Ligand binder design. Structure first.
Ligand SMILES: *Cc1cc2c(cc1C)nc1c(=O)[nH]c(=O)nc-1n2C[C@H](O)[C@H](O)[C@H](O)COP(=O)(O)OP(=O)(O)OC[C@H]1O[C@@H](n2cnc3c(N)ncnc32)[C@H](O)[C@@H]1O
Ligand SMILES: O=C(O)CSC[C@@]1(O)OC[C@@H](O)[C@@H](O)[C@@H]1O
Length: 432
């Protein structure tokens, strides 16, 4: 029974982590039986969720991605905890290349074959007038040849503030916490020498925590903490900020999120006039020799270079070009705006960009909740709901089979992106 079951959430200061803790409380677990451990206090300074904003949009990449995105959309609008941080201003995919414009038309078409009425909220913008109508800040000369796929369920998310909302709720309820060395996972604990029964974890300062179940929601660090047998390859993405005056930023107030697969995106300025800009690229790895728990020998493993641990870090020289390229493409009027708060942000890719949410195959009681594949912040309100379903063996098979333990199911280095990710060692500029 839930009221006497103890759960440990490793990486609980992050996205999937905090979500799991939230839905444990909502399910009826006793708050004092739930322990959140993270290297950083919630909201974790190093979770990929620690950002001014993230994009919300509907992805049809998989069978349950569609179901999950709509589920998340519902909560972002109607859940009292989350709905303050959803800005439902819409999201527009654009392209002016032949190859790219056809990608849009195929995406629109598969949304219709979902047969769940997505045509009511997704539209192909076939002319420049239709684009300028949704995003008046563009000039017509800037967008000639552009077509757009507009999603009315889209918009952006106050990412850090949202996780923080969960965290403060967890604390009011009485969830237990472990931060710093007292919260940094090192290894699982077992009752038996055969390590078939996990009964807790031990952190790096030596602290041992005991629970009935352990959830590993450590994002890009999961593949480094325990042997995931190359299922998850951690990669970095980049962003930068520019500052606008109240006059300049007024033209972008409540404007839709604009994305082009060949350039990146930007999100409307926040209350301080700050615009976040991203490029799009297959990501950056950081391979090192490491020996995650359960691996018999040290392997080559992409290990996150945490901006939180190294604040003087920025990103490779190459990324500076593509980010500015994106700025020129979308916001040419701000090309002389100096960039600041450059930083790398880490995700972990699976081969098929599906999550890795399953019980460990040998360590009974140890559960994996990661494989976010760099598309999963939008799932903050509802992913924890399905992790709990897994813990209780009530997980709908569509999710269960898609999220199953699956080593040898593809090359996660390339995943579903344009190319295998390049490594930080071959991309100078980020260390200072
Ligand atoms: C990097 C990035 C990601 C991203 C994005 C843009 C960038 C630049 N834009 C997104 C977007 O527009 N829309 C979207 O839906 N997602 C976007 N993302 C990715 C999204 O953030 C991630 O997919 C999502 O955050 C999933 O993360 P989850 O797996 O929870 O991972 P996390 O938030 O980083 O959490 C990791 C927590 O791990 C804790 N940790 C790490 N190591 C330990 C150890 N050793 N022990 C205990 N805890 C550990 C960290 O505290 C961290 O909080
Ligand atoms: O999937 C989305 O809703 C937008 S995520 C945008 C992005 O920058 O986020 C970081 C990585 O996921 C990249 O793959 C990706 O291009």
């Amino acid at each position: 029974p839930r009221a006497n079951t103890k759960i440990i959430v490793v990486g609980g200061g992050g996205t999937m982590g905090s979500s799991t803790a939230l839905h444990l409380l909502r399910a009826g677990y006793t708050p004092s039986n739930i322990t959140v451990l993270d290297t950083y206090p919630i909201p974790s300074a190093q979770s990929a969720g620690y950002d001014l904003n993230k994009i919300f949009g509907i992805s049809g990449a998989n069978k349950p991605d569609l179901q999950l995105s709509l589920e998340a959309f519902d909560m972002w609008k109607n859940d009292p905890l989350f709905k303050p941080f959803f800005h439902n201003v819409g999201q527009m995919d654009v392209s002016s290349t032949e190859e790219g414009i056809k990608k849009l038309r195929k995406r629109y078409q598969s949304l219709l074959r979902a047969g769940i009425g997505l045509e009511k909220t997704n539209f192909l913008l076939e002319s420049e007038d239709e684009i300028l109508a949704k995003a008046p800040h563009f000039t017509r000369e800037q967008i000639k040849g552009w077509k757009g796929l507009f999603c009315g369920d889209g918009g952006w998310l106050a990412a850090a503030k949202a996780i923080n909302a969960i965290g403060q709720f967890l604390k009011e309820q009485g969830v237990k916490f472990g931060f710093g060395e007292a919260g940094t996972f090192k290894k699982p604990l077992f009752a038996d020498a055969d390590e078939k029964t996990c009964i807790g974890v031990e952190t790096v300062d030596g602290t041992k925590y005991y629970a009935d179940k352990v959830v590993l929601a450590a994002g890009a660090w999961s593949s480094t903490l325990v042997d995931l047998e190359e299922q998850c390859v951690s990669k970095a993405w980049v962003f930068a900020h520019i500052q606008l005056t109240p006059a300049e930023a007024a033209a972008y107030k409540n404007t839709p999120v604009i994305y082009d697969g060949d350039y990146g995106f930007f999100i409307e300025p926040d209350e301080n006039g700050i615009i976040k800009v991203c490029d799009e690229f297959p990501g950056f790895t950081h391979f090192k020799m490491h020996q995650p728990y359960g691996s018999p020998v040290p392997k080559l493993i992409s290990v996150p270079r945490s901006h939180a641990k190294h604040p003087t870090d920025t990103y490779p020289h190459a990324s500076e070009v593509t980010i500015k390229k994106a700025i020129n493409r979308f916001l040419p009027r701000f090309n002389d705006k100096e960039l600041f708060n450059r930083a790398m942000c880490w995700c972990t890719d699976t081969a098929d960009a599906n999550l890795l949410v399953c019980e460990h195959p040998r360590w009974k009681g140890f559960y994996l909740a990661t494989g976010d594949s760099g598309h999963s912040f939008k799932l903050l309100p509802n992913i924890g709901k399905h992790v709990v379903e897994l813990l209780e063996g009530r997980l709908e098979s569509v999710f269960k089979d898609a999220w199953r333990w699956r080593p040898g199911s593809g090359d996660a280095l390339k995943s579903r992106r344009a190319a295998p990710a390049k490594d930080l060692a071959d991309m100078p500029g980020w260390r200072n």
